[PDB]
Amino acid sequence: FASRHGQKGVIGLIVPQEDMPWTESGIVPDLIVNPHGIPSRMTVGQLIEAIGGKVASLKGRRVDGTAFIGEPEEKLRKELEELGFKHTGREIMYDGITGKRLEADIFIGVIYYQRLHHMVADKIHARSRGPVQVLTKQPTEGRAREGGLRFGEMERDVLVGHGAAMLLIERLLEESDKTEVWVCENCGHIALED
Amino acid sequence: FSIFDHVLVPEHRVLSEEEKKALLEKYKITLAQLPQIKASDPAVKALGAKPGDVIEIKRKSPTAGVYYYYRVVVE
């Protein structure tokens, strides 16, 4: 999921309704975001939109948010104050499990979120044996044709750095392109079996 | 002025034959396995060295106070 202000993320956990907190005015959040994502991302526009969404929903009219001529923030805060809510946009909620109110009042509003098309049902991929190519006889490439994942050179250097020689052999040679060849002991040319 | 007084230049010393054999036997090496130092190197010229000898270098490492490094002289 992603918002219009650049905040992106994946669903981390799905929570039953009775375990969700609820504000003192009877609102149960649809979605919870982490407070650590706001600073170092510096997207005050998201907070302004959060205030504006609840102001618009309470007032029954949509809110202009044009680039430079939109409704100023102070007007939105004053209007929110006039409707019976705190100007800061914060509210008092009670914890879902314990059932007693949290020590701090919490920020809550309405924000526009979009579902992206990078969905896990189209990204999961597994390969146990599968088919192989022709020239190299290595596993194919691509999810559609039951391909295998790529174990590049960097992974080889990582495995060397750990010092796991037999693990390197197992990941590289044992499970792909095993071969047996006869060779004469004076030329070294590949001996031709009959 | 000599280059041995610079802070970046560690001490150098020409090893004699007995400790040459002792060092060559300690690490199970021959003369070809040691690091090489050119004949025209200013340190070699200052020491008056000769290709064939090995120079003992006393390093000043931050991790260890004294560390000995050996180099063989080539042209």
């Binding site: 005015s25 009877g26 609102i27 149960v28 649809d30 969404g53 609840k54 618009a56 929903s57 309470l58 007032k59 029954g60 009219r61 949509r62 309405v110 | -």
Partner: protein, 65 residues
Amino acid sequence: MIVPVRCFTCGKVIGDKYYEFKRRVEAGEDPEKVLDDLGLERYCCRRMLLSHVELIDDIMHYRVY
């Protein structure tokens, strides 16, 4: 496509109130008073009626049998 049956957050049935709200607000009534009259009080419900767009009418033309 069409108006949802229940509010996504709390679950109050608001499916039948969209057309009345649209007609009343189009007539000239203040939308806030109309929403208050319909019974919707928490803003989670009001959002669903306010931000809804009717798209079933302009996709009904293309039929597939």
